[PDB]
Amino acid sequence: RKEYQVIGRRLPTESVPEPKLFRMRIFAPNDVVAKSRYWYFLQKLHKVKKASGEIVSLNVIHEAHPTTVKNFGVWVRYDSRSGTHNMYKEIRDVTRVGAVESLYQDMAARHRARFRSIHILKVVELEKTADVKRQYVKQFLTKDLKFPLPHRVQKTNKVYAYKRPSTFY
Amino acid sequence: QKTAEQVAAERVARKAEKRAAILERNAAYQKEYETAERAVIDAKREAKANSSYYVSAEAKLVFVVRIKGINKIPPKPRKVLQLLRLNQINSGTFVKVTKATSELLKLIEPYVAYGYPSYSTVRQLVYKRGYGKINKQRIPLSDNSIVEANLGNYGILSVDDLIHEIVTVGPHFKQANNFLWPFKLSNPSGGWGVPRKFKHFIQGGSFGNREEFINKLVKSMN
């Protein structure tokens, strides 16, 4: 998981020099996958392909403040067995790359949606506790939050034990 | 019988002249590679200041590796593998990149993994697993007297001079590459970094174009 920038162009053909340039914020494991997914989404917009064009720039976009908790709001299009549906989930994560990673896990768990059948439309960091709609996120945005962790368990590297252990905490 | 004893003193003196010629040429080729890397890195910084994007030159050389074994291979891709000298599983070559040679790689892309090497992986392959084709017969490249005897007509008077032609892609790449016997590589020490080997690099598997990550895969196999 990184958060690449892919600036394409199209070829400098005779008659029309200087093409318009096009930018996208692609998520991918490495540099080779980022260029593949660029041409995929560009092919659903303009008359271009890998033969008729070229990549100008490839830049990694690191997080500004990666040691701070943020409330993201992600829009998604995904394809089910029957058809295709639109959605709007909300995530409480430390980075954009971390938030998008956890979304692909949640879509695969509930809806059985794989990597190939998920279009990330737009990711937005929200400002105020009010814009957030979902209750499962709003639990953790309250005044003076405290809770215990009942039923702790140990993990012995050894097999046998001579105490009859407790679950106190 | 007599005077051949005196030739022992003579013949050694002429090889002392050749070692000086190798040393000065190796110093010159070191100055070419260091200036090549610095010129590209600074050229990006030149363009970035003037609100412009430097696009790098496309790869002039590519290295291929046979992934799939033998049998159950259709006749058209089997013929192309025969031309690129990848008859056995795990085999190297080097290919001079053109439009024509790129179409051959499209036909055989499920059965091979390939990418752009550097002056480091190429240096290890020619020393550790380097072998020359000398009147048929897979003969090793132990001494540089062997390379001068065969490839003395196109320059190439050393092992590093042969490496220079492969990396830079000179006028005698076709002769110099064909001289080398295909590199019989071992299986990778760490692994393939996958559960399954036949799915294409970008989806999950191993085959197809990987650009920068071929250097890591070869050094484990080397």
Added chain:
Amino acid sequence: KSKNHTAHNQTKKAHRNGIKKPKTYKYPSLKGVDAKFRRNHRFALHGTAKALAAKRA
């Protein structure tokens, strides 16, 4: 009851031995050519034999 026809292992048999080109030669076979042309062509080659014989002297 019996199988009629097939073309399986047929092209595979052919490529074992060869699939070859038809050789080609300088001075091809002059057959199926116009008869009026050939009669005059014979007299031309007879006359030019006299010419080269007289030169070598």
Added chain:
Amino acid sequence: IDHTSKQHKRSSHRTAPKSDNVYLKLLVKLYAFLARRTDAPFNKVILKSLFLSKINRPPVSVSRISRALKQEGAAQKTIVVVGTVTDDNRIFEFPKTTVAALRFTAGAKAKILKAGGEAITLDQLAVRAPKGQNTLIVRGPRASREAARHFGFGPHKGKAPRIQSTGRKFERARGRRRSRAFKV
């Protein structure tokens, strides 16, 4: 392993003679030594011809030797045959010559030595000329043999059919003329 060509393939050439003759194998050893050593193309040709069979070594008539002497600038060359040299009674003026061969007939011995020639054998030739200097190799006609006419018979090849005897009432009527069905 993708085997392009066939594996453990034979050379497809006679390495040594199939004959078990003692005196012939002595002659092979002499020329086999020279072919490795000398680096003269002449010696490698004669090494091949000593290995050949009876069909591949046809007889050279003495009239065939006389024709090669009429070549423009080849009067005194030592003509080296590799086979037998038979006598011919279709010629008269046989010139003063030098010949080298494995065998000579009783008639051909008289015809050469009457004019004042030199009937030499290949070992005696090797003493004079190791490299083969001022020589002229001659080979008899292969494809005038009685078996050669029958090879590759069919429509419409123009070859001879394999039969015992002889004229009419024997492979003439149906399939060889338009009156009786067709002309092949």
Added chain:
Amino acid sequence: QKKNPLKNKQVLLRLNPYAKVFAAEKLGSKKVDQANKIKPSATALETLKH
């Protein structure tokens, strides 16, 4: 017995006579470089960050 240039060193020095001069001066390190300018940008950080 084919040795290996990477190990052994005498077989390395049989090839590449430059291996003395490479190893002595430490070219797999080379200080190297440079001020004058840590030399900056213009409008690249707006498109990159956005």
Added chain:
Amino acid sequence: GKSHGYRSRTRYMFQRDFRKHGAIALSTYMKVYKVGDIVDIKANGSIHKGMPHKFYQGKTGVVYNVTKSSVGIIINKMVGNRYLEKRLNLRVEHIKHSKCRQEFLERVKSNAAKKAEAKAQGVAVQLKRQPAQPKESRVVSTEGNVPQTLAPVPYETF
């Protein structure tokens, strides 16, 4: 029973054309044919004499003989595991000149000019044909050409 005639399965091949029926233009007859020229074959539905068999539609061959209304063309065809020589006799209406050899003669004259010209000046010719090489490095100007930020659209019902 099975059908294996001379003009079997020739519904669309010897069909004439759309808006090109009737007579032929006179340039077809005016063209010259010497012994040596390469020629492609096209059957013409209107002309029934000297008509080729369906196999030789689109084939190419060299001319060996010439006569009043026709030209002899040898064509090599594949059968079993061995190529065979075949002799045809087609009329002028079906045959036309090939443009494959045309480009080769242009290359012969140009190379002769480059060798003769450059030897008395340049001392460097480079006359072998180069395959399409990869790119060289360059810089793209962004002045009045700023990148437009795209995004994948959501799903709609047309």
Added chain:
Amino acid sequence: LHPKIVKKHTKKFKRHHSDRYHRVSENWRKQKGIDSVVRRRFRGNISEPTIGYGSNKKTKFMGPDGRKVVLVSNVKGLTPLLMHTKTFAAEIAHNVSSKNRIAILAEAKKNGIKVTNAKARL
């Protein structure tokens, strides 16, 4: 320093179903079958003789001594092995009489030639 002998496969190649049926002897014979598993090589079955099991050319026809054995029937047959004691050992035949063994064994021990048998009945 003489090369140490390694025998590769010391176990005897028995014929298939030699122990099962009495009439089938233990002399080796190749299976020419179509249902046969010994021909096709299945896991957990008897091995077959193959050229890969052949011994080293340095030490072929040599026993534990490092000597190639020669059969001798009389005293005149000992004269090839006079100056070849380290390389060639002897062995006296079964058909030779009791008193003639003493004749051969006497002159054999003079020249220092090792006999495999003898021993010598006693």
Added chain:
RNA sequence: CGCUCAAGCGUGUUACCUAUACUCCACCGUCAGGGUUAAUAUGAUGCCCUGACGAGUAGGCAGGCGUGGAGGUCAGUGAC
């Protein structure tokens, strides 16, 4: 067999097990390419060097093991 915040279902990230496959070395055979009695004891059919390859029914060719008689030869073995 038994398994229930799994030893189940979807997805990710590492380690680890392992084929007669791949790399390297020993030995066997087959095939090719060389070098050599220039007196120089013992097999020129010799004596060495270098490189590749090895599944297989029907089928074809090659090199060997044994049985009964015939010609030669070890002045072969044997009532001890």
Added chain:
RNA sequence: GUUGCUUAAUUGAACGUGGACAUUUGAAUGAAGAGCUUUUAGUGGGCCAUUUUUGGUAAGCAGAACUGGCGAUGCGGGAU
């Protein structure tokens, strides 16, 4: 230059005599040597898989197309 062909012809068409131009043998890649001849064995019941596909409700049914397998083939995995 050549002729009995062809031209109103001193034209044309075939096959030539002498002459000029070899780094740059005028795309890529490979080449395990290339081309050719004679002779004779077994075989002429086939079957399964991925796509293309006709009959049929459908079939471990019948019948074609293109490559790959089994038959002739073990070895690791799919419990078998």
Added chain:
RNA sequence: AGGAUUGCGACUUUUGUCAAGGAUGCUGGCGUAAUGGUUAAAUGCCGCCCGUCUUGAAACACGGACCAAGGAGUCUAACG
């Protein structure tokens, strides 16, 4: 593995030295059933009954209770 020397080199002020065209050095115990060989049983894993016709056999397909000797591409007239 190999079994006189020959080559490429390195370190040397020099002679020489060396990890440089495949292991040498020093020490102990025993010198025979101890190491190995065959043979029988036990233990771990693996192994269906051969021959045959067949697309396909361990087959609910055919022949085989057991052993000894005998038992099947020979010779000829024209021929390639």
